[PDB]
Amino acid sequence: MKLSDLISRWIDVEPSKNAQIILRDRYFMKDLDGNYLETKWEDVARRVARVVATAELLNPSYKKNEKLDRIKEWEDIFFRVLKARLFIPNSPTLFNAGLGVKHDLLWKPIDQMTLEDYEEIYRSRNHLHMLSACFVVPVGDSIEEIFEAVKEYALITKVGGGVGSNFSELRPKGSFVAGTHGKASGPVSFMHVFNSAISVVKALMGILNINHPDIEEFIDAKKVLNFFNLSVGFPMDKKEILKLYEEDGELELSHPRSTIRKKVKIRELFRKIATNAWKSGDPGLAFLGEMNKYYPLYPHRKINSTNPCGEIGLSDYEACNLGSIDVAKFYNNGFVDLEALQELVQIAVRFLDNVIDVNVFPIDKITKAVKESRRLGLGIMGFADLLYKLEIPYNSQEARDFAANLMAFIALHAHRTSYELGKEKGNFPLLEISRYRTEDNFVPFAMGMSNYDDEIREVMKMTKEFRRNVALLTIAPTGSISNIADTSSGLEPNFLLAYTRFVTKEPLLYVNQVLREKLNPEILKRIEKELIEKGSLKDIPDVPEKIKKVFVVALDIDPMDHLLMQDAFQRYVDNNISKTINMPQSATVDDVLNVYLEALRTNVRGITVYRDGSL
Amino acid sequence: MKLSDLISRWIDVEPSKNAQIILRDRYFMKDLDGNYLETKWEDVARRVARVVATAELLNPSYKKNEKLDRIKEWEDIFFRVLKARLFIPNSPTLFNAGLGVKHDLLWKPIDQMTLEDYEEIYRSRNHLHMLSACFVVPVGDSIEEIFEAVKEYALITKVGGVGSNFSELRPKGSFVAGTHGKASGPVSFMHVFNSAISVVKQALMGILNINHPDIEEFIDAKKVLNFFNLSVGFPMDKKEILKLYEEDGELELSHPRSTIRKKVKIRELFRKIATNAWKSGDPGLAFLGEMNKYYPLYPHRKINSTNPCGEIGLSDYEACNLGSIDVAKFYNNGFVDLEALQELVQIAVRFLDNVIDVNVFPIDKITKAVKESRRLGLGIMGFADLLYKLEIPYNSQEARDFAANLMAFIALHAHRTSYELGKEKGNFPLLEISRYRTEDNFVPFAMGMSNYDDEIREVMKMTKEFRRNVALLTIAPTGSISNIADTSSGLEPNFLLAYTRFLLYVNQVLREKLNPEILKRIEKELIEKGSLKDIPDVPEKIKKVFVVALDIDPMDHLLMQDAFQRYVDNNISKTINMPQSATVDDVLNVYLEALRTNVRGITVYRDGSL
Numbered sequence A: 001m002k003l004s005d006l007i008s009r010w011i012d013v014e015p016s017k018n019a020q021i022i023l024r025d026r027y028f029m030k031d032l033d034g035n036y037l038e039t040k041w042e043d044v045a046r047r048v049a050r051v052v053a054t055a056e057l058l059n060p061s062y063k064k065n066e067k068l069d070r071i072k073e074w075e076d077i078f079f080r081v082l083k084a085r086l087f088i089p090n091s092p093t094l095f096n097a098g099l100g101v102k103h104d105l106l107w108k109p110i111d112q113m114t115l116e117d118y119e120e121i122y123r124s125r126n127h128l129h130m131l132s133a134c135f136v137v138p139v140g141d142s143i144e145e146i147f148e149a150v151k152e153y154a155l156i157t158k159v160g161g162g163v164g165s166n167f168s169e170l171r172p173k174g175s176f177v178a179g180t181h182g183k184a185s186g187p188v189s190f191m192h193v194f195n196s197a198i199s200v201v202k203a204l205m206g207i208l209n210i211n212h213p214d215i216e217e218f219i220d221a222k223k224v225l226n227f228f229n230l231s232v233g234f235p236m237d238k239k240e241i242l243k244l245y246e247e248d249g250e251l252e253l254s255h256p257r258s259t260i261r262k263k264v265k266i267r268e269l270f271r272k273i274a275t276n277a278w279k280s281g282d283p284g285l286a287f288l289g290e291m292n293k294y295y296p297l298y299p300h301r302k303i304n305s306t307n308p309c310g311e312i313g314l315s316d317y318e319a320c321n322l323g324s325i326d327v328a329k330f331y332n333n334g335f336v337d338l339e340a341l342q343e344l345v346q347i348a349v350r351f352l353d354n355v356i357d358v359n360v361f362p363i364d365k366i367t368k369a370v371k372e373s374r375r376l377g378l379g380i381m382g383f384a385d386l387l388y389k390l391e392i393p394y395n396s397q398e399a400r401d402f403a404a405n406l407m408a409f410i411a412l413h414a415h416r417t418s419y420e421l422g423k424e425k426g427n428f429p430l431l432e433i434s435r436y437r438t439e440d441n442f443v444p445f446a447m448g449m450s451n452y453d454d455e456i457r458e459v460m461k462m463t464k465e466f467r468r469n470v471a472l473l474t475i476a477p478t479g480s481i482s483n484i485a486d487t488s489s490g491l492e493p494n495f496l497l498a499y500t501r502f503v504t505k506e507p508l509l510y511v512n513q514v515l516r517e518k519l520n521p522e523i524l525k526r527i528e529k530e531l532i533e534k535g536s537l538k539d540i541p542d543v544p545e546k547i548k549k550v551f552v553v554a555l556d557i558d559p560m561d562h563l564l565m566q567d568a569f570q571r572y573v574d575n576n577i578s579k580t581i582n583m584p585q586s587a588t589v590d591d592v593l594n595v596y597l598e599a600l601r602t603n604v605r606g607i608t609v610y611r612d613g614s615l
Numbered sequence B: 001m002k003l004s005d006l007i008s009r010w011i012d013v014e015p016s017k018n019a020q021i022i023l024r025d026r027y028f029m030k031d032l033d034g035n036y037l038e039t040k041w042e043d044v045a046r047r048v049a050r051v052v053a054t055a056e057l058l059n060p061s062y063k064k065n066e067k068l069d070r071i072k073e074w075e076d077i078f079f080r081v082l083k084a085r086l087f088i089p090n091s092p093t094l095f096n097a098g099l100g101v102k103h104d105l106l107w108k109p110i111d112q113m114t115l116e117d118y119e120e121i122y123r124s125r126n127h128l129h130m131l132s133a134c135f136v137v138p139v140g141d142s143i144e145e146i147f148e149a150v151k152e153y154a155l156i157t158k159v160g161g162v163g164s165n166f167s168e169l170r171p172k173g174s175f176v177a178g179t180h181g182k183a184s185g186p187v188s189f190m191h192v193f194n195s196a197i198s199v200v201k202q203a204l205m206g207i208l209n210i211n212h213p214d215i216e217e218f219i220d221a222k223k224v225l226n227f228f229n230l231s232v233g234f235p236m237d238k239k240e241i242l243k244l245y246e247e248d249g250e251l252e253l254s255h256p257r258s259t260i261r262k263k264v265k266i267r268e269l270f271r272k273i274a275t276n277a278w279k280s281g282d283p284g285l286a287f288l289g290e291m292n293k294y295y296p297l298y299p300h301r302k303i304n305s306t307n308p309c310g311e312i313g314l315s316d317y318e319a320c321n322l323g324s325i326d327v328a329k330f331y332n333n334g335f336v337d338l339e340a341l342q343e344l345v346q347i348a349v350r351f352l353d354n355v356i357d358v359n360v361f362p363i364d365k366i367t368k369a370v371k372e373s374r375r376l377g378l379g380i381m382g383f384a385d386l387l388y389k390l391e392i393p394y395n396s397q398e399a400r401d402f403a404a405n406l407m408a409f410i411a412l413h414a415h416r417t418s419y420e421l422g423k424e425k426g427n428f429p430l431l432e433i434s435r436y437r438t439e440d441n442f443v444p445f446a447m448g449m450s451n452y453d454d455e456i457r458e459v460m461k462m463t464k465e466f467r468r469n470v471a472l473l474t475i476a477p478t479g480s481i482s483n484i485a486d487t488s489s490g491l492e493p494n495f496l497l498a499y500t501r502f503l504l505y506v507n508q509v510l511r512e513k514l515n516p517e518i519l520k521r522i523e524k525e526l527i528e529k530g531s532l533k534d535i536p537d538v539p540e541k542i543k544k545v546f547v548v549a550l551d552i553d554p555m556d557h558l559l560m561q562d563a564f565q566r567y568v569d570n571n572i573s574k575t576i577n578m579p580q581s582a583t584v585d586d587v588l589n590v591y592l593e594a595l596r597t598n599v600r601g602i603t604v605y606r607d608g609s610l
């Protein structure tokens, strides 16, 4: 089917009542009187579309005469595509698009739009029209830098971004300084200033490397640092670490600018991490090494840290804007409609590329970084619900293969578009010095799970000359936009099939739409209460097999099947993937370690685990 | 007696065992293995004397061919005055002078020094060569400026004490034309500063104006910010606030970037301040308005904060280096040796003024605000011990008249030294646009309790043409330097006559004027009861004279602060000590009196509080 026909099937469907509460809450614009400028999703769509379309001015391929009706093509498409809720950019894009712009340009009917209107939009974008979500900033070994980073966190947060850092440069607690001669506080201490800053500018990523002398104390640093997610950094190769472990080897903890040295059994270090994650979900693992392995600019540039949820490895001062396709709405008669998914990837990658052009950053080292690489994060949401529609159990193999294929297709046409764009609009500045140029068989992910592999290699070849973006794909958690879209989040399985929203306060008993659209209505009413008490189908009498096997939830799916699904997707994603490894209450410390080890033998770039009943 | 004879009396009097312990712990320079480069107070004195003498390199009135002689004469006068402990610069000067300078150079004999040697000292001063106690930084109403400020706190603290007025920060809940938000408030924002300092190894000043919407929350913000002293700012005239209180009127709380506004009874507010001070000692009162009244650069520059102990009111990015004279060493047969004192005062001013030129700051706008104003903080210590020798009770009008004359004489000669350095080296860049120039009869303290006033008036007039410094005087706490000097602290009475602190003292003047054996006898009781008051079979004359802090009532405390402040161009560190049984009304009563006197701030501590 044609995108245009699918759009016509979605465009007049309004968001549900649950999304609407969310929209009125933080998403509809409010004039300084506290009033409402937007009252319906449609309006937000109009605003965002118009503004993102605006980046077409900067297009060297357009002449004049043509430029107007042209931007009026992209605004309509972008518009149609977001009204349908077929593609949605990260929240920042939706809050801040067109802040600074005059209130009568943003919503006026399109065929009253003039060329000068779109130039005015371009110019009126103020210092809070920050349309991206992920940032990383460094924190060098120095006070001037430490406290400049605290300032940077604040400002990025003011504008609605999430940021992280590797703190491994900070010399250990106890070090010599002069300096001052007072002794170095250590990174775990300095992270308190980071924590305190954000407590007052109303989540962050904090990484320390496994070989830092203070690591043991970091692993323990939330037993506080309540605005931090913490992960343990592995900048060496995965294989190197897995080896050392299986030999019961020892690790040298040391730092360039100190004389503090220690040796620890790596198994014990892992046990310490495992226990704390077992206890409370922190810290995660970040396989920095593995991220660099696939980084076009490594070792010229370096990936040292992820943003708060791990899904973008970013170099210093680099940011990345994201958005996601609801693959659930591409379900056509037992198949994913590839003909409509392709056009939309085409459309989405241009949209996201356009965002960068209309974007404003609090710190122009970040503006620089961004213009230089133009790293995007096209992803998906609604995947679990799509598995539902296709009758594929999440925890299966079929599911992972399908996943790998879906992702592979998207990867393909996403990059083919970075191509057609690097042609039409000019290469991302740093192409030349990238592994796309000086390498040969450079692929920004592992592959090995799809037919599309060979076509992908070609394209990465056609990409030695034309390429708008260092990278293009990710899988975000989509905590909010999957809500807006009425669909499951990112690549996660549904946590529950049924729960109780309270109206604001009344029992509104929500059941998953697809469960409704498939399981018998009488059956449902019987089981409902029990489903909500147990949070799963599996132990419920008189529900057919077909259905318990298809409509699995996160806790129905064992840790390993989670891990392996993450692997399938990482194989065709250039950035990382946000994935919680859910573990049953009855899981042990050993169970966590085993997850960790498996993670080591797969192509996952990080690890988050969550034990049910932990916190 | 000439200063140089005075010097000969004290130069060989060894720092006491207690003083020497302190010197080792934190003043004697150590080499890069924790070995001792300095083992004697004399070494400190040499090093500091020489570094500061080096400033003479930049003297425009010396020809290149007299410089070496002049530089060495200053090192020598500085060295002697310091070894004798007649005058001592603020700790940072002790800690840091000479950092970055080859060792073979700091302590070498003066006879052997060349013009090149001084030049090598001047040019090898590193970024830790930070010689000032007191800083104030602005904290403007943006995320940008708030976190810049925090980084400055970090930086100053890493090398230094700092205060801010947080009043620019829109009230908690305010509209943020920035974004979705609601401004967090000055108080929460101050938590970032406390947290930064909890982590940078080196006390902080936090001020919020009485009429900022968050003042109530502020006043309670320590009923944490464990690193802050807090004060209420009164930017408006002291008279105006007294009137309001007497009329039982109301104060509007507002902020130029908020719609948050509220009315409060000034009395209930004051009583709340006082209630907390009564419990805990915080917050103090900072009479900003009264600091601006005497601020030569007002209204073009403005004073919004003090440093941590409140003794220097400073404009944005301004820093100030302190130094104190031990006035007890000036006692001579019933009198203060005013001849000797005047010479030291001239030296002490040049010394402090030279410290500027060899001082390195960690932020260029401080370098600039200091070069432009050249504010000094010459003060006194040993005042209480002096009174003992003079047989004058601290709690009497006799002491306070003595204090005013004493401080008036010092003020006199200091401003007169400032004229002379103005003439010899050049005026403080902003002389031309200050009230010493653009206004007649301007005086930067209230005067009014000395025969020296007239004389001070005309030195101020003369200072129309030449003036090296916008301001010269303070009275600092002198917590550590008065120990280095074996004397009493600032203008404070001795807190105790005999006491063990971490071991044993016993007041040296009391040792000297008390009948021994009937010291031995009573010594047990005094050491526990903490006063001579209720020990019998001790005069009387001794009882009257040898009073301690808790023997002196709060008004006698406060009026001594008044007496000195009439003759100090900056402010004054004085604790108004209250007995345990004092009441919240006794504290209000202090404040009311504070408002009538010429005091520039208030600190109260009730015995038994914390």
Ligand SMILES: Nc1ncnc2c1ncn2[C@H]1C[C@H](O)[C@@H](COP(=O)(O)OP(=O)(O)OP(=O)(O)O)O1
Binding pocket: A141, A142, A143, A144, A146, A170, A171, A176, A177, A178, A179, A180, A182, A183, A184, A185, A186, B157, B158, B199, B200, B201, B202
């Ligand atoms: N005063 C301090 N207290 C605690 N830690 C400090 C202090 N000053 C610096 N540190 C920590 C911060 C960094 O982790 C590290 C480097 O400090 P920095 O400000 O760079 O000193 P420096 O660079 O002048 O001396 P160094 O050459 O030793 O790095 O030590």
Ligand SMILES: Nc1ncnc2c1ncn2[C@H]1C[C@H](O)[C@@H](COP(=O)(O)OP(=O)(O)OP(=O)(O)O)O1
Binding pocket: A157, A158, A200, A201, A202, B141, B142, B143, B144, B169, B170, B175, B176, B177, B178, B179, B180, B181, B182, B183, B184, B185
């Ligand atoms: N996200 C936030 N959380 C808490 N307080 C904030 C936040 N953002 C700003 N503030 C407070 C900090 C300052 O006191 C005040 C000013 O913020 P600031 O960054 O100056 O906004 P702005 O200058 O961009 O716009 P404006 O000054 O016109 O409101 O608001």
Ligand SMILES: O=c1ccn([C@@H]2O[C@H](COP(=O)(O)OP(=O)(O)O)[C@@H](O)[C@H]2O)c(=O)[nH]1
Binding pocket: A089, A090, A091, A092, A133, A134, A135, A160, A161, A162, A163, A203, A307, A308, A309, A310, A311, A476, A477, A478, A479, A480, A481, A482
């Ligand atoms: O409340 C939030 C949620 C997310 N993020 C950041 O936005 C990224 C994308 O998260 P998600 O897709 O879950 O957010 P959404 O765009 O659906 O609101 C996260 O990894 C974080 O870097 C953030 O700063 N604040």
Ligand SMILES: O=c1ccn([C@@H]2O[C@H](COP(=O)(O)OP(=O)(O)O)[C@@H](O)[C@H]2O)c(=O)[nH]1
Binding pocket: B089, B090, B091, B092, B133, B134, B135, B160, B161, B162, B203, B307, B308, B309, B310, B311, B476, B477, B478, B479, B480, B481, B482
């Ligand atoms: O630990 C300290 C003690 C004092 N001061 C500063 O020095 C001023 C005066 O302190 P004092 O005279 O007691 O210090 P000393 O010169 O005796 O070391 C204070 O208000 C602060 O500005 C500081 O920065 N850190």
Ligand SMILES: [Mg+2]
Binding pocket: A141, A142
């Ligand atoms: Mg450094």
Ligand SMILES: [Mg+2]
Binding pocket: B141, B142, B143
């Ligand atoms: Mg602002």
